[PDB]
Design a protein around this ligand. Structure first.
Ligand SMILES: *[C@@H]1O[C@H](CO)[C@H](O)[C@H](O[C@@H]2O[C@H](CO)[C@@H](O[C@@H]3O[C@H](CS(=O)(=O)O)[C@H](O)[C@H](O[C@H]4O[C@H](CO[C@H]5O[C@H](CO)[C@@H](O)[C@H](O)[C@@H]5O)[C@@H](O)[C@H](O)[C@@H]4O)[C@H]3O[C@H]3O[C@H]([C@@H](O)CO)[C@H](O)[C@H](O)[C@H]3O)[C@H](O)[C@H]2O)[C@H]1O
Ligand SMILES: *[C@@H]1O[C@H](CO)[C@H](O)[C@H](O[C@@H]2O[C@H](CO)[C@@H](O[C@@H]3O[C@H](CS(=O)(=O)O)[C@H](O)[C@H](O[C@H]4O[C@H](CO[C@H]5O[C@H](CO)[C@@H](O)[C@H](O)[C@@H]5O)[C@@H](O)[C@H](O)[C@@H]4O)[C@H]3O[C@H]3O[C@H]([C@@H](O)CO)[C@H](O)[C@H](O)[C@H]3O)[C@H](O)[C@H]2O)[C@H]1O
Ligand SMILES: *[C@@H]1O[C@H](CO)[C@H](O)[C@H](O[C@@H]2O[C@H](CO)[C@@H](O[C@@H]3O[C@H](CS(=O)(=O)O)[C@H](O)[C@H](O[C@H]4O[C@H](CO)[C@@H](O)[C@H](O)[C@@H]4O)[C@H]3O[C@H]3O[C@H]([C@@H](O)CO)[C@H](O)[C@H](O)[C@H]3O)[C@H](O)[C@H]2O)[C@H]1O
Ligand SMILES: *[C@@H]1O[C@H](CO)[C@H](O)[C@H](O[C@@H]2O[C@H](CO)[C@@H](O[C@@H]3O[C@H](CS(=O)(=O)O)[C@H](O)[C@H](O[C@H]4O[C@H](CO)[C@@H](O)[C@H](O)[C@@H]4O)[C@H]3O[C@H]3O[C@H]([C@@H](O)CO)[C@H](O)[C@H](O)[C@H]3O)[C@H](O)[C@H]2O)[C@H]1O
Ligand SMILES: *[C@@H]1O[C@H](CO)[C@H](O)[C@H](O[C@@H]2O[C@H](CO)[C@@H](O[C@@H]3O[C@H](CS(=O)(=O)O)[C@H](O)[C@H](O[C@H]4O[C@H](CO)[C@@H](O)[C@H](O)[C@@H]4O)[C@H]3O[C@H]3O[C@H]([C@@H](O)CO)[C@H](O)[C@H](O)[C@H]3O)[C@H](O)[C@H]2O)[C@H]1O
Ligand SMILES: *[C@@H]1O[C@H](CO)[C@H](O)[C@H](O[C@@H]2O[C@H](CO)[C@@H](O[C@@H]3O[C@H](CS(=O)(=O)O)[C@H](O)[C@H](O[C@H]4O[C@H](CO)[C@@H](O)[C@H](O)[C@@H]4O)[C@H]3O[C@H]3O[C@H]([C@@H](O)CO)[C@H](O)[C@H](O)[C@H]3O)[C@H](O)[C@H]2O)[C@H]1O
Ligand SMILES: *[C@@H]1O[C@H](CO)[C@H](O)[C@H](O[C@@H]2O[C@H](CO)[C@@H](O[C@@H]3O[C@H](CS(=O)(=O)O)[C@H](O)[C@H](O[C@H]4O[C@H](CO)[C@@H](O)[C@H](O)[C@@H]4O)[C@H]3O)[C@H](O)[C@H]2O)[C@H]1O
Ligand SMILES: *[C@@H]1O[C@H](CO)[C@H](O)[C@H](O[C@@H]2O[C@H](CO)[C@@H](O[C@@H]3O[C@H](CS(=O)(=O)O)[C@H](O)[C@H](O[C@H]4O[C@H](CO)[C@@H](O)[C@H](O)[C@@H]4O)[C@H]3O)[C@H](O)[C@H]2O)[C@H]1O
Ligand code: GAL
Ligand code: GAL
Lengths: 58, 172, 115, 57
């Protein structure tokens, strides 16, 4: 009967959907750390600087 | 500042933080809120404990001439023979906990047992600085966060002034 | 270690008692430093509304928060300036937590935020 | 909630559940219907009793 064949494919459908879910989570986690670090590094880059007061010679 | 006669050679003994909710936010319970602070190689984690009596909680919705006068406010009784509340707010606020002082409460959602912050409400968090760090000094960096159970945290970041000239100072 | 009542210093839990040196001991006199080595990490509880976290069964539930302490001087022999650190926290079931940071160019203070 | 004056320190005293049939379904008698609930290590089994008078209807 059709009942047996339906159950077999059902298991396969669940496993496939889990794979595509894993890709999206892993990619978002990788891009999270890069975007956070870039923002913090740029903030330090703009604000920091050195200034010359006076120059003397002998 | 802890010195009134000469604030120049003084240190910070008390700190007050004004906290509100964001626009279009769900209610936040302050009992599940943790406060982090970093000062001179010391990372603190402060927590409020809810109680019916002897709780670091004060209501000041009608207005006050001094905010720092709620330290003398009664929270509990010494014994059974007490006619009025004679246990002060100073005696319960230590090095592990913070106090909650209500400024605005439109819907009456804030209690000592259940401190729930709603839309339009405002609270002041008091930290005993002389207990936690032992007094904050001149030209020092303070960094911390107010972390709820659900939601986005509030950021604390300031540098203490180079010289303390007055008794009460604005930090952030 | 349990630290849910609050603390003035997080790094003070290193001196906290975990066990007894002898059977004659009155209090827990074995410190947390002595058991944390190069192969293991320590768990410090910050929040537990459900009371699900114990030494025998450290089960993390909804609304709970923990601190993981690593003896860096034992594992790597001290982390240095301007070095990249990458890692993961892998559960048995679920998606992992990501650790990625670079150590500051110059250590100016005692306690520093990394990530 | 059971407290009107201060709902913060209150508990739920009554619960209402809206129930309909599915699309293209045969009629269901509610007298032969059993309701299960699980809360804090307590498994309940509730049942309606039909009556002419003194019935919860
Ligand atoms: C806030 O900031 C201020 C300013 O920065 C202070 O730091 C203050 O701390 C308090 O300081 C005072 C004064 O130092 C402390 O009180 C003192 O307690 C001592 C007890 S102890 O010895 O066990 O430590 C002494 O009893 C002090 O008395 C001393 O001073 C007397 C006066 O000395 C003056 O003499 C001549 C003028 O006559 C002058 O040329 C000198 O330069 C000097 O000023 C002296 O007779 C005693 O023999 C003894 O040495 C005591 O100070 C007392 O006097 C001061 C003030 O007059 C001094 O100018 C002040 O009123 C005090 O209230 C008073 O007790 C106190 O312990 C600290 O808390 C911060 O809170
Ligand atoms: C819904 O939620 C709310 C809020 O969370 C409550 O929990 C409520 O439960 C009800 O609580 C009230 C108050 O606790 C209960 O009524 C009380 O019944 C008692 C009988 S018993 O002793 O056998 O248990 C007493 O008769 C209570 O009277 C007490 O309080 C009087 C006032 O104390 C105040 O005094 C000063 C101000 O003057 C202030 O500084 C204090 O902080 C304090 O508020 C006092 O004179 C009596 O000696 C006695 O100790 C009685 O409470 C009564 O008063 C309250 C309210 O004014 C207090 O602020 C309220 O109107 C009550 O209606 C009233 O009866 C009740 O049993 C609970 O059901 C939840 O339903
Ligand atoms: C941090 O550093 C601070 C340095 O600025 C300070 O040292 C803090 O400690 C606090 O010290 C003050 C005294 O300076 C104490 O405040 C007083 O407490 C009593 C409580 S009681 O049990 O001893 O009675 C009382 O609440 C006083 O208030 C009176 O005065 C106000 C205003 O005039 C009025 O509402 C009432 O009359 C009330 O009785 C309070 O002292 C204040 O008032 C005086 C004078 O006006 C009195 O004539 C001074 O102006 C003083 O500066 C005021 O504080 C605190 O108990 C203590 O915590 C430290 O934490
Ligand atoms: C937090 O900690 C605090 C210490 O850091 C403190 O313990 C706080 O509690 C407060 O304690 C004071 C006592 O120190 C209490 O005030 C006293 O109240 C009693 C009421 S009774 O029912 O117990 O009798 C009484 O009214 C006291 O008055 C005395 O003094 C006056 C004046 O000299 C006299 O007329 C009376 O007959 C009586 O003897 C009162 O204590 C005050 O007076 C003393 C001394 O002068 C006594 O010799 C101190 O100056 C004290 O500061 C005064 O308050 C408070 O009720 C309580 O809040 C805690 O919260
Ligand atoms: C410029 O920016 C950099 C980031 O791009 C970085 O922040 C620089 O700061 C430097 O950071 C490094 C850490 O990587 C540190 O240098 C190390 O210093 C200690 C000695 S200590 O006294 O400072 O504690 C360490 O022992 C290493 O010194 C060795 O090498 C030098 C030669 O350069 C020699 O004089 C010493 O005797 C000693 O042998 C040094 O680490 C470097 O060497 C290692 C290995 O070879 C060690 O075996 C690695 O190659 C590493 O990449 C090197 O950095 C300082 O704290 C700081 O200068 C900033 O200037
Ligand atoms: C679960 O928790 C609840 C907390 O919110 C609550 O405690 C529940 O208990 C219920 O308590 C309410 C009172 O708050 C009772 O409701 C009242 O019951 C009487 C029955 S009688 O036999 O005593 O007469 C009556 O039905 C009242 O209705 C009147 O008011 C409505 C609307 O104004 C109107 O149709 C009629 O005038 C009618 O007589 C009813 O009380 C309600 O109305 C009042 C006021 O408006 C009266 O002026 C309040 O608004 C109140 O909140 C309303 O409930 C229940 O009997 C009891 O189960 C607990 O189960
Ligand atoms: C809030 O904080 C305060 C201050 O920190 C208290 O800790 C308070 O707890 C209460 O403490 C008092 C004192 O320890 C307790 O009162 C005792 O118990 C009885 C009353 S009852 O419990 O039986 O109803 C009595 O009042 C006792 O008093 C006796 O001792 C005194 C000596 O001080 C003496 O005058 C008499 O012999 C008298 O009989 C008292 O010891 C109270 O139960 C706590 O709530 C906290 O709520
Ligand atoms: C913020 O932080 C500071 C630290 O920087 C404090 O922790 C402070 O809390 C306060 O602590 C002091 C203790 O140093 C408390 O003062 C005590 O009050 C009791 C009253 S009661 O609690 O017993 O009811 C008492 O009056 C104490 O006095 C005793 O000790 C002195 C010695 O100093 C002695 O002369 C007396 O005879 C008596 O034995 C007193 O020390 C204060 O209540 C707290 O607010 C925190 O707010
Ligand atoms: C503020 O005022 C109201 C009346 O408006 C009431 O008396 C409260 O007790 C007070 O806190
Ligand atoms: C309560 O305690 C006070 C001192 O705080 C005093 O001994 C009273 O007699 C008691 O009732």
């Amino acid at each position: 009967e059709t009942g047996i064949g339906t159950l077999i494919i059902f298991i396969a459908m669940v496993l496939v959907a889990a794979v595509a879910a894993t890709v999206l989570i892993n990619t978002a986690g990788s891009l999270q750390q890069r975007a956070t670090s870039t923002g913090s590094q740029t903030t330090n880059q703009v604000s920091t600087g050195l200034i010359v007061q006076s120059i003397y010679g002998m | 500042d802890n010195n009134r006669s000469n604030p120049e050679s003084g240190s910070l003994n008390w700190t007050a933080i004004y906290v509100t909710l964001n626009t279009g936010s769900s209610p936040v319970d302050l009992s599940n809120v943790s406060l982090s602070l970093e000062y001179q190689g010391q990372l603190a984690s402060l927590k409020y404990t809810p109680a019916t009596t002897n709780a670091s909680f004060a209501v000041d919705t009608n207005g006050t001439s001094n905010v720092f006068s709620v330290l003398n406010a009664g929270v509990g009784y010494k014994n059974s023979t007490a006619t009025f509340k004679n246990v002060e707010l100073k005696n319960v606020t230590k090095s592990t906990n913070f106090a909650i002082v209500v400024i605005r409460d439109p819907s009456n959602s804030l209690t000592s047992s259940h401190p729930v912050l709603t839309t339009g409400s405002e609270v002041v968090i008091l930290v005993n600085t002389s207990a936690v760090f032992g007094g904050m000094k001149q030209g020092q960096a303070v960094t911390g966060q107010i972390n709820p159970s659900v939601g986005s945290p509030g950021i604390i970041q300031f540098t203490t002034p180079s010289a303390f000239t007055e008794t009460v100072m604005e930090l952030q």
